[PDB]
Structures are given as C-alpha cells and as structure tokens.
Design a protein around this ligand. Structure first.
Ligand SMILES: Nc1ncnc2c1ncn2[C@@H]1O[C@H](COP(=O)(O)OP(=O)(O)O)[C@@H](O)[C@H]1O
Ligand SMILES: [Mg+2]
Length: 377
C-alpha cells in the first residue's frame, strides 16, 4: 500500500490510489489537509492541528515553516532573512541551521529535516488509521526549484520517519499527473501550473513529449499566499473594532489570533458565498465582536495582491519562449485558487480558456503523488 504525500510549507496532504481511484485521507479531526506545525510542551510533542491550535499560548516552542530551511546552510541569505520573522530560535551548528526549543524542561535542537520527519510521521499515521495497515512506501513531492541538497534532505526526512521514499517528484508535475495530462496521446503539450497556497506562490511551465516531463520555467513569489489575504482582513477588522469601541487590540496576542482564525474561516466561506459573518465572544476586555463582510469588500482589500499574481505568469511564459496561446493545459493548485476572483483573473488572462480545477487544488499535489506511488510499487 503505497501513499502519496505532499509535504507543504503550511499544509500537508496524504493520499492513496486503490481500486482504480485516489482517496485523500482525512486526519483525526476530519481535515483532508494537515498544518505543517510541530509544537513542544513540557509533557508531549504536538503535530498538525493540535500544534497550530496552541501557537498563541506557546509561541517560542511552536515550530513551522521548516520547509523554508530544509536543504540550506545557516549562512544562506534566505535563511537569515526568514528567521527575522519567526518567534522560535534558529542557531548555527557547524554551518547547518537548527531550530532550538524547550521540551520536557530541557533544551533540544532539531535539524529542518528532523522537523519535517515529524510531519511525515503524522501523515504516515493518518494513512495507517484509515487503511488499517502499516504504510512503508511513499512518494514525496518537492517544489520544482529544489536542488539536489533540498531533494536529498526531504528524502532523509522520509527515511527518518520510517518511510521508504520510492521517488521524489516535482509538485507541479504531480499536479499534471493528477489530471492525466501525460496520457493525452498527441503532439507536444505545454502545461502551465498556477500554484497559490498558504504562504507561497509558484508558477511552473511544463512540456510533455511522449509522456515525458520537462520543466521549462519557474516563477512566483516565496512570500505570497492566503496568509497575506488573512492579514489584510485582520487589519481591516482591527481598524473597525478601534473605530467602534475606541480601543486597539493589536497588542493582545490571543485576541489577534482569535480574530485571525475567524478571518481565515470567513475567507473560505467567501469562496462559496457572497458574504460571511464574524462571531467572537469577548474579543477584547469583555467586548463581543459580531459583524460580517461581503465578497466584494474582501476582493477590494486584496485587489493589488490578486492582480499582481499575473506578473509571474507573464514572466514564466517569457522565460519559456512561449506565447499565452501556446499553452495547452492550465491547472489550478493550492487552496487559495478556490477564490473566485483569482480564477476569473487567470481565465481572463488566457482569453476565456477553461481551467483544470475539478480536483480540490489543495489536494492535487498529493493526488498525483498517490498515482505515481501506485505506478512505482
Ligand atoms: N475554500 C477556500 N477559499 C479560499 N482559500 C482557501 C480555501 N481553502 C483553503 N484556503 C487557503 O489555502 C491555503 C492553504 O494552501 P495549501 O496549498 O493547502 O498549502 P501549501 O501552500 O503549504 O501547499 C490556506 O491559507 C487557506 O486559507
Ligand atoms: Mg502546496
């Protein structure tokens, strides 16, 4: 029983191909995606939903974004810039970066691939709970721009977790496999992947010749995702609360966190409804916060971020020596592509060409990895 695992920057996903169909496996809370969070307390180690739910109460020991550190050295310019926004420590150990936290009263340090192995261990256990069998073989996906060092450190994360990594494949290639684009018998196919996720945005252009994949160009934004859309909503409601009650809640970490989760939940509703309501009891100094927001207002708060996503698309087309009319298939990947304004922008950019989106975009990477896992097993 081989599984396909998407090891995401913010959310991870595991699937299994069996009986001619792919099953995306939900976790113990019923979620088909699991946050890439690891928390350390004085009693136990929390992974996934349980780790993210207590980040406000234990910020210095809750580790996330380990994918940004994996396969890199401490002297990397990206590593030094990212650690300026993390509440946890990142120390140097013979040139390698290590996260340092407090666990069971003592100090412990972990390499990035060790943190990712804990996430893979959770995805391994999520699959075993549904399958009722022991899971050993797996295909793990990585971004197309990952080098050998980053691909090897991801493979080591699977080995530490007890998995036998059958093959490391690219995330956009896995998305194209999910839609069977490599099985369309015909001429050469140019495929563009539009992957807008939690904190990252990746555009990839692939070429399928005789079922063989080739990465032609990559572009995007390493710090653009659904979290930036949530922050725009948070600042919107913070100013609204200050306007109504003459009080600023910015310095209350718990209040800001509770408002941020309500904004994220309201954002998901705005993809399927034209409005959503915020309901928080005793947000700040005993004052309840009951309001709403329309889809139009959500789009206006992110008009500059939404339309800016087409700049990497034009850059990827230009790097691949291709006109937009030369694209044969367009694939939507990442949970943020459920936003109707995002889909409208990309379809208008391609002059009304239909988009591949029937598969849940935050599950398409794990979907294709599961198909590849069954082929290689
Ligand atoms: N129905 C929805 N509408 C809008 N945004 C969504 C929806 N579902 C999930 N999201 C957003 O998608 C993001 C998750 O991205 P995902 O691709 O799953 O993670 P990663 O980028 O790490 O792979 C979250 O920020 C979440 O807010
Ligand atoms: Mg992703």
């Amino acid at each position: 029983p081989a599984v396909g695992i998407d090891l995401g920057t913010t959310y991870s996903c595991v699937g299994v191909f069996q009986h001619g169909k792919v099953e995306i496996i939900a976790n113990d809370q019923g979620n088909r995606t699991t946050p890439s969070y690891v928390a350390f307390t004085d009693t136990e180690r929390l992974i996934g939903d349980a780790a993210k739910n207590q980040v406000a109460m234990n910020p210095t020991n809750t580790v996330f974004d380990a994918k940004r550190l994996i396969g890199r050295r401490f002297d990397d310019a990206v590593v030094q810039s990212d650690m300026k926004h993390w509440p946890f420590m990142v120390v140097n150990d013979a040139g390698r970066p290590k996260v340092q936290v407090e666990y069971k009263g003592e100090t412990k340090s972990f390499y990035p691939e060790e943190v990712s192995s804990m996430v893979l261990t959770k995805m391994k256990e999520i699959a075993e709970a549904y399958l009722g069998k022991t899971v050993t073989n797996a295909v793990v996906t990585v971004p197309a721009y990952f080098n050998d060092s980053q691909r090897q450190a991801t493979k080591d994360a699977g080995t530490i977790a007890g998995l036998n990594v059958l093959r490391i494949i690219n995330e956009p290639t896995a998305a194209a496999i999910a839609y069977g684009l490599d099985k369309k018998v015909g001429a050469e196919r140019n495929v563009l992947i539009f992957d807008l996720g939690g904190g990252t945005f990746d555009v990839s252009i692939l070429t399928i010749e005789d079922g063989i994949f080739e990465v032609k160009s990559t572009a995007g934004d390493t710090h653009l995702g659904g979290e930036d859309f949530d922050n725009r909503m948070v600042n919107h409601f913070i100013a609204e609360f200050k306007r109504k009650h003459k009080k600023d809640i910015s310095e209350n970490k718990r209040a800001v966190r509770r408002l941020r989760t309500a904004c994220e939940r309201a954002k998901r509703t705005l993809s399927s409804s034209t409005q959503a309501s915020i309901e928080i009891d005793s947000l700040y100094e005993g004052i309840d916060f009951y309001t709403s927001i329309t889809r139009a207002r959500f789009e206006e708060l992110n008009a500059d971020l939404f339309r800016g996503t087409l700049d990497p698309v034009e850059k990827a087309l230009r790097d691949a020596k291709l006109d937009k009319s030369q694209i044969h298939d367009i694939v939507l990947v990442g949970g943020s592509t459920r936003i109707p304004k995002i889909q409208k922008l990309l379809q208008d950019f391609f002059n009304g060409k239909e988009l591949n989106k029937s598969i849940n975009p935050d599950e398409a990477v794990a979907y294709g990895a599961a198909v590849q896992a069954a082929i290689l097993s």
